[PDB]
Amino acid sequence: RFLKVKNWETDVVLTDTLHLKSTLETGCTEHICMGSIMLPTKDQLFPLAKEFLDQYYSSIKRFGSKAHMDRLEEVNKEIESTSTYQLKDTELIYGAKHAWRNASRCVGRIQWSKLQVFDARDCTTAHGMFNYICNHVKYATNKGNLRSAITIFPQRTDGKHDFRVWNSQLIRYAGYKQPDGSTLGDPANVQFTEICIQQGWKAPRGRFDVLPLLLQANGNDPELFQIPPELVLEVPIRHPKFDWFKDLGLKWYGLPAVSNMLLEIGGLEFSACPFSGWYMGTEIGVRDYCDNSRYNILEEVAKKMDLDMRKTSSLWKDQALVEINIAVLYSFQSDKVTIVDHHSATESFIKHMENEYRCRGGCPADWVWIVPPMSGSITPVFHQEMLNYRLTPSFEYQPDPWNTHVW
Amino acid sequence: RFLKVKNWETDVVLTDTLHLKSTLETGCTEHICMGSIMLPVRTKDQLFPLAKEFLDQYYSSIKRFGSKAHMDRLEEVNKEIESTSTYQLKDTELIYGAKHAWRNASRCVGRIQWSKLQVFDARDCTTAHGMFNYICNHVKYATNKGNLRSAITIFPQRTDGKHDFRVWNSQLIRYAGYKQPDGSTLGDPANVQFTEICIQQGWKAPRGRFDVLPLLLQANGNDPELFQIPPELVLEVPIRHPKFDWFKDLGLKWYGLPAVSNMLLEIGGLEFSACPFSGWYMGTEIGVRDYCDNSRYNILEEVAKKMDLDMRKTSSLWKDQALVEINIAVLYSFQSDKVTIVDHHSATESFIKHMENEYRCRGGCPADWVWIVPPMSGSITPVFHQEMLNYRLTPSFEYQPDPWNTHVWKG
Ligand code: HEM
Ligand code: HEM
Ligand SMILES: COc1ccncc1CCCNCc1ccc2ccc(N)nc2c1
Numbered sequence: 001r002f003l004k005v006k007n008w009e010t011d012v013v014l015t016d017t018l019h020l021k022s023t024l025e026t027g028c029t030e031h032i033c034m035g036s037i038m039l040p041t042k043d044q045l046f047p048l049a050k051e052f053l054d055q056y057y058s059s060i061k062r063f064g065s066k067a068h069m070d071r072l073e074e075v076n077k078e079i080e081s082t083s084t085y086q087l088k089d090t091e092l093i094y095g096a097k098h099a100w101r102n103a104s105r106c107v108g109r110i111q112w113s114k115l116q117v118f119d120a121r122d123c124t125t126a127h128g129m130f131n132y133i134c135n136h137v138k139y140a141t142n143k144g145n146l147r148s149a150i151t152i153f154p155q156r157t158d159g160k161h162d163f164r165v166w167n168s169q170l171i172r173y174a175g176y177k178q179p180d181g182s183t184l185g186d187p188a189n190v191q192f193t194e195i196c197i198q199q200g201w202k203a204p205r206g207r208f209d210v211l212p213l214l215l216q217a218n219g220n221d222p223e224l225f226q227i228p229p230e231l232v233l234e235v236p237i238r239h240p241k242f243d244w245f246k247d248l249g250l251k252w253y254g255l256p257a258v259s260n261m262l263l264e265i266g267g268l269e270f271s272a273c274p275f276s277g278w279y280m281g282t283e284i285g286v287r288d289y290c291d292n293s294r295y296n297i298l299e300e301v302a303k304k305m306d307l308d309m310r311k312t313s314s315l316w317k318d319q320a321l322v323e324i325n326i327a328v329l330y331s332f333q334s335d336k337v338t339i340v341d342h343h344s345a346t347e348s349f350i351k352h353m354e355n356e357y358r359c360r361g362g363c364p365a366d367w368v369w370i371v372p373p374m375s376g377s378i379t380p381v382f383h384q385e386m387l388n389y390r391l392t393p394s395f396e397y398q399p400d401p402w403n404t405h406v407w
Numbered sequence: 408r409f410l411k412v413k414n415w416e417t418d419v420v421l422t423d424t425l426h427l428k429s430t431l432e433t434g435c436t437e438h439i440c441m442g443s444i445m446l447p448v449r450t451k452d453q454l455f456p457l458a459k460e461f462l463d464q465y466y467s468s469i470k471r472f473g474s475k476a477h478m479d480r481l482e483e484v485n486k487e488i489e490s491t492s493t494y495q496l497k498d499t500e501l502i503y504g505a506k507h508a509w510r511n512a513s514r515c516v517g518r519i520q521w522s523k524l525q526v527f528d529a530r531d532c533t534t535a536h537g538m539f540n541y542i543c544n545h546v547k548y549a550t551n552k553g554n555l556r557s558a559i560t561i562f563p564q565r566t567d568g569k570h571d572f573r574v575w576n577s578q579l580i581r582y583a584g585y586k587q588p589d590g591s592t593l594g595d596p597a598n599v600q601f602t603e604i605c606i607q608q609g610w611k612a613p614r615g616r617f618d619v620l621p622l623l624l625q626a627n628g629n630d631p632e633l634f635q636i637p638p639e640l641v642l643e644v645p646i647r648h649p650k651f652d653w654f655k656d657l658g659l660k661w662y663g664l665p666a667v668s669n670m671l672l673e674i675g676g677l678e679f680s681a682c683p684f685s686g687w688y689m690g691t692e693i694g695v696r697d698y699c700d701n702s703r704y705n706i707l708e709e710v711a712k713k714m715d716l717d718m719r720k721t722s723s724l725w726k727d728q729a730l731v732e733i734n735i736a737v738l739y740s741f742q743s744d745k746v747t748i749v750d751h752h753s754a755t756e757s758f759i760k761h762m763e764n765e766y767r768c769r770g771g772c773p774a775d776w777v778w779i780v781p782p783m784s785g786s787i788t789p790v791f792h793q794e795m796l797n798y799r800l801t802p803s804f805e806y807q808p809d810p811w812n813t814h815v816w817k818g
């Protein structure tokens with residue numbers, strides 16, 4: 001019931017007490033581990049509100065204070081009357097920061113306390129959402145000196161008035177299926193693109209078309225908007241040694257801004273809560289570029305390098321992989337756009353983890369997601385035992401809105 | 408209950424029904440996943456249902472379930488258990504069991520090979536000298552002059568837990584490690600403790616960087632005895648690089664035969680505490696883990712200097728660059744010397760096919776993603792994108808405590 005995690009490289013054991021406070025299910029049982037599976041009323045509300053307010057008031061050294069009891073009382077009253085309740089600004093900021101702190105799949109959590117929270121609960125229309133989103137993008141991008149941010153739209157009411165950003169990230173490239181049978185652009189984004197076209201987007205049918213926003217306010221039908229091109233910071237990808245690399249026509253955007261998750265704070269649900277940090281190089285160079293069902297450029301790069309692609313044992317894929325990732329980091333650094341390599345990031349996470357164990361009693365972590373997609377065991381997280389469990393406030397996945405939407 | 412797994416690269420969906428046969432526990436609960444945790448004297452009471460479960464599986468596999476031979480065997484075993492408190496497996500059952508322990512090993516990426524395993528029955532062994540002879544024979548057979556053949560040698564099962572057969576080595580072939588007074592380590596730091604034990608037991612150590620350890624062998628619960636494997640039986644491969652001529656001067660080599668010797672084999676409730684087994688290497692075990700772990704030989708820096716990489720900032724990816732070149736060298740060297748080895752691309756590709764075959768014909772394939780995914784270039788192998796279900800089936804290979812921590816010394 002009290003658990004130890006060992007680092008097998010350093011021999012440091014840490015003791016987890018925090019897992020006891022876990023509330024949500026993992027998907028695992030005593031007979032089966034599902035660790036690698038990607039996606040495993042007023043009566044319900046108040047204990048959740050209570051559990052949250054208790055941790056909030058504990059955090060400000062005011063546990064068991066009249067202010068604590070008063071607020072608890074106030075919220076309870078508001079739930080009885082209105083069936084929901086409204087978070088104070090302080091509580092919303094605390095909750096958003098703690099959702100990130102609790103994200104067991106996030107390697108960048110050493111940054112969790114430095115998050116700019118934009119309260120957009122006064123938003124009523126998709127045009128308003130667009131304005132708020134543009135402001136977010138500009139603030140977060142900051143001419144390449146990226147700053148973590150989240151923008152929070154009104155909370156779910158009866159579920160038939162949801163605010164949703166239909167896009168999976170604020171900035172992403174379109175995908176088009178060809179008659180030639182191939183895929184042009186990002187294969188990951190074919191279905192969403194089609195939805196944009198159905199709604200009236202005029203597609204430039206290119207390889208790197210920044211997608212338009214499809215924004216849904218108050219459960220109403222979603223609308224299209226184009227992010228001002230001047231707010232979208234992109235990076236041409238070149239290699240520091242290979243002059244030919246620039247001829248591949250590759251570029252990526254600076255701002256990773258996830259827009260399809262659900263933020264849960266104190267039992268309240270924020271279905272529209274786009275947030276952004278900055279990239280770890282491997283997200284672009286390993287996954288975005290080298291995944292088979294993404295841009296899948298390994299073969300092309302391998303050829304320009306003139307490698308023996310006869311036999312897998314020459315490790316030509318592994319060689320091309322490293323060079324692609326060298327280029328990504330080189331390109332962002334050269335243009336002064338914030339990026340972190342997987343060595344620096346995992347090293348930071350180990351220090352964060354030690355901090356959290358020391359000051360919080362633990363740190364929920366998903367090893368399958370925390371270990372980078374290349375060079376795994378030469379990063380310190382590979383050798384670190386981790387415990388995965390679910391704490392609230394939390395970021396949750398939610399269904400894509402089109403499967404849900406009563407048009 | 409049906410469980411689905413999805414491959415996120417191909418959208419192939421498999422359905423698992425085999426997990427229903429899982430009996431043993433995982434370590435996880437509905438509140439916590441222990442998936443990344445390395446490690447999360449029986450009564451006749453529990454023994455017969457375990458024997459019976461196994462024998463039912465055996466007889467089904469040979470299409471003789473419910474047969475007179477089946478029923479007679481169950482009867483025979485029950486009598487033997489109730490009169491002698493244990494039982495003996497037939498040679499056929501032992502072979503079936505060893506192959507299935509391997510088939511069931513969720514951490515093993517090499518399981519496409521499971522049905523091809525040479526089983527050496529050493530249950531007639533009585534002394535450490537006897538164990539030494541059996542192990543020499545296993546090494547020579549398995550090595551086969553570089554054309555590696557998977558094999559397992561099985562010593563007598565546990566009785567009262569006071570007469571255990573144990574191989575004290577973690578692997579039959581492994582390099583010594585010596586802690587120096589200045590805090591540095593010579594040889595393999597992984598084996599410092601075992602090396603000290605060998606030295607204490609009488610081993611005269613050469614004190615070099617790649618000294619093959621002596622065998623420390625325990626028969627019938629007696630104090631263990633030291634033997635040296637004949638050098639002519641130890642196949643080694645000097646490591647060189649196909650393009651880089653300075654790589655040979657790093658002075659690296661490795662042994663050809665990975666032969667794990669500290670696991671416990673459970674078949675039908677019987678415990679085989681000494682069951683050394685061997686296959687062949689996947690290149691990354693040597694090139695990534697053995698050579699590049701900070702707590703092992705740790706050669707990344709030296710290699711990186713010789714390549715003249717920019718080592719001032721991690722974002723140059725110098726470590727990643729050196730790591731690939733080292734792994735190329737390992738594969739090149741083994742192939743050049745005609746010693747069996749498999750690269751991580753081939754091995755993971757083969758495992759996916761194995762896993763799919765197992766889903767269709769067996770209803771599942773328990774797999775530990777954390778261990779299956781190779782320690783370099785993870786997501787450019789197909790296993791990274793494959794969802795897996797981890798659960799425990801018997802027969803199985805289990806961890807056991809190191810014998811120096813439990814052994815009662817006779818003196
Ligand atoms: C500031 C720099 C940040 C870095 C370097 C970083 C790094 C990462 C990486 C590499 C992943 C794995 C993503 C993938 O493989 O698809 C991840 C996941 C995640 N991040 Fe962070 N992150 C950062 C900021 C943030 C912020 C500001 C938030 C929220 C406020 C956040 C919340 C999450 C969540 C919820 C996941 C899991 C997403 C999922 O399950 O799909 N991250 N992060
Ligand atoms: C034939 C070629 C084989 C290959 C290429 C192979 C490959 C591997 C690899 C790479 C690992 C991970 C080891 C580590 O990272 O420490 C592993 C684990 C394992 N292998 Fe295989 N293997 C082979 C044969 C065998 C055989 C013959 C057996 C038993 C009869 C076996 C049983 C196991 C077991 C029980 C594990 C888990 C070890 C642990 O938990 O520490 N393997 N295998
Ligand atoms: C459920 O997971 C999937 C299912 C299908 N396709 C793709 C996925 C991957 C999910 C994408 N999550 C992607 C993400 C989330 C948060 C981040 C925060 C910072 C950062 N640098 N990158 C992030 C990247």
Ligand SMILES: COc1ccncc1CCCNCc1ccc2ccc(N)nc2c1
Nearest residue numbers: 008445446517665667686687688689692806
């Ligand atoms: C619980 O075990 C550990 C814990 C911490 N450090 C190290 C270890 C040792 C893990 C060693 N597994 C070692 C092994 C076992 C079977 C194999 C079969 C074939 C093969 N090519 N390699 C194997 C390699």
Ligand SMILES: C[C@H](O)[C@H](O)[C@H]1CNc2nc(N)[nH]c(=O)c2N1
Nearest residue numbers: 036037038368369791792793794
């Ligand atoms: C099947 C497996 O869970 C899946 O491929 C996971 C593996 N680890 C990952 N890790 C990160 N950071 N991101 C991912 O999308 C995935 N995908």
Ligand SMILES: C[C@H](O)[C@H](O)[C@H]1CNc2nc(N)[nH]c(=O)c2N1
Nearest residue numbers: 382383384385443444445777778
């Ligand atoms: C902490 C973590 O479980 C540990 O480092 C694991 C990770 N995956 C592994 N995978 C393999 N094949 N071998 C290992 O030793 C490990 N070590």
Ligand SMILES: OC[C@@H](O)[C@@H](O)[C@H](O)[C@H](O)CO
Nearest residue numbers: 577597598599600601602669
């Ligand atoms: O020096 C002794 C070690 O080799 C030994 O303790 C192993 O690490 C252990 O047996 C796990 O394989």
Ligand SMILES: [Zn+2]
Nearest residue numbers: 028033435440
């Ligand atoms: Zn689990």
